[PDB]
Write a sequence for this structure.
């Protein structure tokens, strides 16, 4: 049964540095863009909406526009990879990725900023 | 539920706008 896993559910990061939190999802041989839904959120803010290969930038929260970034190269590898450039203190909190690829599951990652 | 996820992102984005 489709299950999402995370390598790290706590990330401790320095303020102002870059970070990449990851959610691993089962992919087999090839990736079907037309079947993948990926969602990234933290607390009460939208970060990423990427639905069957279409990313809607209008729904992304303003505090993440121009800093928040989903590395689609890794998607072929079964990795939902969120990249936030120049992290702030406000970037600390509970993050959540949501993947649909056949089945559907989510996991949570705590991000702490020194 | 991916359909539920779309509804929450739509509501929250609409609120921020
Ligand atoms: C399920 C669903 O699509 N809900 C939803 C919530 C909000 C909005 N738009 C606004 O609130 C402005 C659309 C759909
Ligand atoms: N608005």
């Amino acid at each position: 049964a489709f299950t999402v896993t995370v390598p790290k559910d706590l990330y401790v990061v320095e303020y102002g540095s870059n970070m990449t939190i990851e959610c691993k999802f089962p992919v087999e041989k090839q990736l079907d863009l037309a079947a993948l839904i990926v969602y990234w959120e933290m607390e009460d803010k939208n970060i990423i909406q990427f639905v069957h290969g279409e990313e809607d930038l209008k729904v992304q929260h303003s505090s993440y526009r121009q800093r928040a970034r989903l590395l689609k190269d890794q998607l072929s590898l079964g990795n939902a990879a969120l990249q936030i450039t120049d992290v702030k203190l406000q970037d600390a909190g509970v993050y959540r990725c949501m993947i649909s690829y056949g089945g559907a599951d989510y996991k949570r990652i705590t991000v702490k900023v020194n | 539920d991916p359909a539920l996820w779309q509804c929450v992102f739509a509501a929250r984005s609409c609120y921020e706008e």
